[PDB]
Curated annotation (Swiss-Prot), chains A, B:
SUPFAM superfamilies the record matches: cAMP-binding domain-like, Winged helix' DNA-binding domain
Name this protein carries in UniProt: Listeriolysin regulatory protein
Gene encoding the protein: prfA
An MF annotation (GO) of this entry: DNA-binding transcription factor activity
GO cellular component terms, semicolon-separated: cytosol
Domain HTH crp-type, residue spans: 136-211
Amino acid sequence: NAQAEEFKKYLETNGIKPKQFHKKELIFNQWDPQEYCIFLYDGITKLTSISENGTIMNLQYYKGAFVIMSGFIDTETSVGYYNLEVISEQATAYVIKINELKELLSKNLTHFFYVFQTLQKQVSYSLAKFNDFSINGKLGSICSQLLILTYVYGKETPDGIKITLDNLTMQELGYSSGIAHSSAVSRIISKLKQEKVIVYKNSCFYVQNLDYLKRYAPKLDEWFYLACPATWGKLN
Amino acid sequence: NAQAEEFKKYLETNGIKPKQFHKKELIFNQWDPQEYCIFLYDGITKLTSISENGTIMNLQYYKGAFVIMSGFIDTETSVGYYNLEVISEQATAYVIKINELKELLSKNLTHFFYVFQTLQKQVSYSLAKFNDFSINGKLGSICSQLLILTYVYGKETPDGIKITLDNLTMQELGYSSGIAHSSAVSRIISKLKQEKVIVYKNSCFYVQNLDYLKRYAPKLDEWFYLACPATWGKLN
DNA sequence: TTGAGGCATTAACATTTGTTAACGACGATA
DNA sequence: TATCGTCGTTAACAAATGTTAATGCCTCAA
């Protein structure tokens, strides 16, 4: 992205060099809260939370370049206890101390607006996602989450639209929609397989009826159209 | 509170004076989408969306002072098609044109951080709310929404904690949690009535077991502690 | 006093989802 | 080769939620 490359060179002009992480590694976590401004430049990650009773929740995925704040900018305190796990093989991110960030954005306003814009993309995204997961229950939550992955990690193929995401087990989908048991997620997939909506070929998901998912996630599709028009046009 | 007064006097220097609205009135809407930056100064509102088949969704409430973005700052387009209905008798809000906002925040950087902070409070709120409504289904969604209302509109009294909302029908709670039929909301409330969690006096809600709701909304309670510590202290 | 309409409660059914378990396929280690 | 572990189906059962309808309470309007 053009605005992220200029934000890279800027952070590298002020001595904020990149750090490397590998799969399964946590940039920040929920137990040792440290207020950071993560600038995920390259890689794929998921924001998770583990309750006291052990249940895992997959709140959302993040694909670079994007910005994830674990602390506020004025109070410099925590926004919440979450984990940011790397799920791609390797991921590069610039870890910025919350205090210095405040100083970098006051210098240059083009990068202030950039971090502000990406923050607006976060707000609209959560509202849309919250809207679609609530109306139609779990079937809609699985359909809605699949629609997200299809736009971001989808590539057209002979057999539909291939989701280029490894280790997307049944447990990982259930975590995204609040389903605790893999058998429940599976039962829903067997209904979508029978309805010719998707095919689970080779431990990879193929989408053949994009319109059906658009039915159950109208606001999320509306969001990709409005907020990520390039990613949306590639499938329309 | 205090930082909003400085944002008031500031807005009262660049000729962007406040407009007054009454109950049932829509500041912005989904069908005629104008891009504005709302600075709700005083009053109560709800952000809604109406599907194509008429179903209503209540995404969240807003009590001044707060900021609601209906459009992006860089692209100057809409963040999504939503309605912002006034539910209090009278509400005062400063309507800012989206094209003017970018120049106004560059003048004073302390008010830039203010609008930036309130957006981080929006992001954290949506993640927490999304987290708690997903784990335990609809019972948890009603409990979580109730926990929200209890902190923002709750006042301790001899019997229970009064949720001071004039119109809080069964149908309006279902809209907040994705329940389409009021009879389903009632059945859930009848379970909470029998379990000594809440009572129903004068079409008004009273909470007697706040801890029971915290079980079903751990992230939302965590959020009030971190983001609205004053509102949290009033009940702890 | 009469009658209409909104709202809450309850019921009874249909559908979905939570929960536990058995079967069978695949990969890995020795 | 044999055998353990993980993950995906499918089943059966329990529990929650969707859906519709009848009922009773209340305010309003004439």
